């Protein structure tokens, strides 16, 4: 009946001191899967090794004392390629929700139970091996994610143990992909995401507000801003109709109670508590789960668009607290999954799938030969030469791309170019050809006189990368030898707008810029 | 054929005149393919023997009943259709290994894609040709390995997936795959590196691993290292995708010619584009050739026979007022005279027209004089300081067929 | 149908140069079983601590390619406790067959079979755990056993990998003894030894000669003596009648051919292939088993004493090898496991098991209290204290308790002391008591003054050691305060004579003296 037993499912182990003054967004530590992995046994790491490519289903345990008295909250981040410190320097917080992110509250009912389950392959969409790539990197960043905690006595130690669950070996380095071009939704989208602590406090605070309805194109948290995977997949439309199932959280202390209502909400202050309570409303004591409906003056929300619909949270009965108790009352909502409605949206701009790349003006040839060349990759990305002024558009394609880590498929490139000088005395030529390896005989190609407009398939890299196509291996790149006096002829040369043939994308991430 | 390897005879090769030629064989001996086998040495630290050994080859058939076609079934149709298991069938070069330390043996495996360098040429081969096609291959290769050296040195070697140099540790390389051989065996691989996927094109994308673990040990007596033979056989294609080498449509570029010279008088240049597909190259223009892996099976197959559309396209110099002339293009038969199909263009500066690769099927020198499709290009135009580039052009394999495997040294 | 795969059963690894210019007892290099289990990854080495206690059956493999020209035999030697270097300096042969040994010629079918398996616990007799203890440590030396080998034409590097089963974990730390008190033999007894290199040269050398018939007591091996555990099993009677199987094994390259003949002999060449050839014998032509019947002029042969008995080996048909070919031929002969005959033989001094331990005499009391004490432990070892001249005795208790690794049970210490004096002016005193812990009140005791013999039961320590007790848990000590004027008293104070009550021993060893 020997209790002390081994425990064959620690895959790794870190730990931080908790600062006893530690505030909001303050970086606890990080901790590196792999490093981790290896840095410790060699169970699975040996396995690690002979396996090479599996498809792992960690269970992260952060131990951490169930305090009911400080009023604390760590939370954990997941960031397989997309997060800098240096720029959010240190601290984070809403742009980090902006990744897989489980909030830990310590009141919360454990003292290890403090863990997070996910499948590295589910969440990164491309199973992991021993070898270290560059295209991506497994690190969690741990960091307080509450406010209104207690100055604790002392900076307390802090430990987390990973465990794995390696599986067999998985035969592809792609996985399957976590979507397809037509962003196709189905009966429950997860838009996953956790909302920075709300709080209310015993000195009149009024209508707690979850702006929701605006979850489509990107946003701006002060620091930053934000394109996640849920946002670029719900941008494509002008509006959303349905229901948003979510859940609060309690983070402060015992000492501090309170009570509040949850309601839809369009306006400013449904100052009646008689208007809250005479609609659907659920009057939520501290934690709890919610489904509600969206509710508008017309119904449906818009997805770009703020002020068009809003989660409204009342506070019913004031925070309770005992006069030695300092601090406001925390809780972190969580939206979850939203069942679509039934009433249609129109999609962005048309139906047709055609999206503005970048328009490139300005175009400065060489001294010499006044002929400009232009090289368009093989990877989706923020365009840009020295040899022109490249002005870049946004649209859900462009979002999808950049909240998503791989992407895969074909494209046409929707060229367009124009001349200057009156019909008469315009001249030149320009070519384009699909390359492959750096200047040289690989290839297939056409010329254009006064033929000012092409498409031509191309495909995006081995594999499928998003940034410096990986190897050499980075077809795609067209020349645009402008043959033209480039100069005081192209109006604005070149317009790319491609079109998604059919592209794969891998990888639920964001990008903060 | 090392000898030490069980035989006095057995030295012997068993092959199928048809399998590998694709185009059975008759009696009159025509030009465009001639069977003549080369015997050379391929082994490097032999022993000095003590006199000049008369050597005897003897050559037995099975003539088998009368084809009635001369090209059989087509080694290839033009997309390229991988099945279960393709046969890279390539022997590599007697790797060696010598008691004063020699470290990480390596058949840089995993750019079996392009044209390779081999010192004295460079090589298109029908494997990398086959294989050329898409940016990157992942599965598993079956090879075997072969001793040459002679009984007094002996050795044992590792077989491990790599990718970078040096993996120090045989903890390293007794940690993860590996299979330690004593000298001759057979070993299937899966290939691995840090993306699991291979380059195709590109080296320092993965590689094959041969650590020297007990070093070779001969009597001092013994002069000489240790010395085998790798053989690829066949690969087993994994399942994940690997995009294709432009896009996806069969479009390669064939030549684009520049700077036309017109004849002085009437300035006008023709150009004739042949029939079968090969290095064109006038001297009324400066021809620059392309690569892609059409033009590499091309290149590293006997015949070729199907259809294409020879996609034109032209352009002119002065400014939009200042610019005249015309082209012409017709499909031809023999010789300038009536025999063909014609059109005219002005200011229409591209075209497109199908046309049919040569009496059977030829590479070069279209056999007779049963060679269709030359397409003259009466560039009418006062080509000189007129066509800017005057035609590229751009082959479409509208679907061919490729026979013979062969290679292609340059 | 992947060939290249991992291999889990690996345990570590070790390297060593063979020199070209190799001769015999050459140390090529050790292996210590624990540090490498370690050093090298961790699959079996979290096992091994997660585990604590198991009983490895370990698999060397030592990989040398299959040269058949090179006329070189490395051999290996499996030490956990009894072999010390820089006695035996760098350099070691017979002495070290005195272990546990397997000798790998290379000509031998294998470029990896040279590989040895056996389990720790059947020869060790204890089990084996993560934590190491000082009585114990498993290291393994590989050195050259051969002499007439070919000069390399370079120093070969040589590669052993280790490979272990670790089974479950094992509850107890001594396992099943390896051996009982009263030496009770069955039906084949292991007399697992290998014989040095014999050699035969085309040049007349005649009768090679394992003398067989003389296992029983110690032997000087020129560097050294020994007591190996055969040697003390079969030394309890005057001599051995049976039947003995056991190997030759030709080291010689290929260029060196022979043929011997094996045939029981007792004097000094039986000149006569036709004496060879009329009775018993067995024509060799290099390897084969062979089990021969004891031979001598009154049937059996003797254990201690030498020269009653021996095993012939005639050699035949000279030695063919090209001229250019140096070098002897040469063969390592394994004696195996010997079948018990029938006829009886007396044992060594008397039926009664009881052995004479030692004997001391001018005992050097204290100058002042003129009083002796002296304190016998509690494991059976080579006593020796500087307040008398110890003269130690030998007996086959001696030999097997030297022999082995561990032993625990009861013994007898029956002492007997005698005073010098005329009857009449005879003075003093002895007093024994068992004692525990250094001098304090730990214990059980009696005084004598002209009785003058006693007999106490006492019994060796905690588990069961060979020297140094391992801990204060070394209990038995007994003082012997012979409060007497010792001096010109104690004629030979006590004799002691250790009866074996029934003891236990542990791990098949040798000790080289």
Redesign the interface.
């Known amino acids: 009946a020997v209790t002390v037993v081994?425990d064959?499912t620690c895959c790794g182990t870190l730990s931080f001191k908790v600062p006893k003054d530690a505030k909001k967004g303050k970086h606890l530590g990080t901790f590196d899967i792999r490093q981790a992995i290896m840095d410790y046994?060699?169970?699975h790491?040996?396995?690690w090794?002979?396996k090479?490519?599996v498809n792992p289903t960690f269970t992260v345990r952060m131990h951490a004392p169930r305090n009911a008295f400080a009023g604390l909250s760590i939370a954990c981040t997941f960031d397989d390629y997309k997060r800098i410190d240096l720029p959010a320097l240190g601290n984070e917080c809403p742009p980090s929700e902006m990744f897989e992110l489980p909030t830990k509250v310590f009141m919360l009912k454990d003292a290890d139970v403090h863990e997070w389950q996910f499948n590295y392959g589910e969440l990164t969409g491309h199973g992991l091996?021993?070898?270290?790539?560059?295209?991506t990197q497994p690190t969690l960043y741990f960091f307080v994610a509450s406010t209104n905690q207690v100055t604790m006595a002392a900076d307390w130690q802090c430990i987390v143990t990973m465990h794995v669950d390696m599986g067999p070996v998985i035969?592809?380095?792609?996985l399957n992909p976590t979507m397809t071009w037509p962003i196709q939704l189905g009966d429950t989208f997860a838009i996953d995401r956790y909302y920075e602590a709300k709080e209310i406090k015993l000195d009149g605070s009024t209508s707690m507000l979850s702006i929701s309805y605006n979850f489509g194109g990107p946003v701006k948290h002060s620091k930053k801003h934000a394109i996640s995977y849920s946002r670029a997949v719900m941008s494509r439309n002008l509006g959303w109709s349905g229901t948003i199932s979510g859940s609060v959280k309690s983070v402060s202390s015992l000492f501090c109670t309170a009570s509040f209502v949850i309601f839809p909400w369009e306006c400013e202050a449904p100052p009646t508590l008689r208007q809250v309570l005479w609609g659907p409303h659920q009057i939520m004591h501290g934690d709890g789960q919610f489904e509600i409906a969206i509710k508008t003056r017309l119904h449906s929300a818009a997805t770009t668009e703020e002020g068009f619909g809003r989660l409204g949270i009342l506070p019913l009965s004031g925070p309770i607290a005992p006069d030695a108790h300092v601090g406001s009352y925390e809780f972190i909502v969580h939206i979850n999954t939203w069942r679509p409605d039934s009433q249609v949206h129109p999609p962005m701009f048309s139906s047709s799938e055609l999206y503005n790349w970048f328009t490139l003006t300005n175009l400065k040839p060489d001294a010499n030969t006044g002929v400009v060349n232009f090289d368009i990759p093989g990877y989706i990305h923020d365009f840009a030469s020295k040899d022109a002024t490249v002005t870049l558009a946004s649209n859900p394609l462009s979002w999808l791309v950049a909240a998503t880590g791989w992407h895969?498929g074909?494209v046409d490139l929707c060229i367009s170019w124009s001349r200057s000088k009156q019909?008469?005395?315009?001249?030149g030529?320009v070519?384009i050809?699909?390359?492959?390896?750096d200047w040289?005989?690989?290839?297939?190609?056409?010329?254009?006189?006064?033929?000012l407009r092409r498409t031509?398939?191309?495909?995006?890299?081995?594999?499928?990368s998003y940034a410096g196509a990986?190897?050499?291996?980075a077809?795609?790149k067209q020349n645009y030898v402008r043959?033209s006096i480039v100069n005081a002829k192209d109006i604005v040369a070149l317009r790319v707008c491609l079109r998604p043939k059919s592209i794969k994308f891998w990888g639920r991430s964001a990008t903060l810029f």
Do not use: H, K, M
Not at 423 to 427: G, L, N, R
Not at 433 to 437: E, L
Not at 440 to 451: C, E, K, L, P, V
Not at 470 to 473: D, E, F, I, L, N
């Open positions: 081994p064959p046994g060699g169970l790491s040996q396995e090794c002979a090479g490519i091996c021993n070898w270290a790539n560059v295209a035969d592809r380095f792609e895969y074909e019909a008469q005395a315009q001249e030529s070519s050809t699909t390359n492959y390896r040289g005989a690989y290839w297939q190609g056409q010329a254009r006189i006064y033929d031509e398939a191309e495909i995006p890299i081995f594999l499928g990986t190897p050499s291996g077809l795609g043959i």
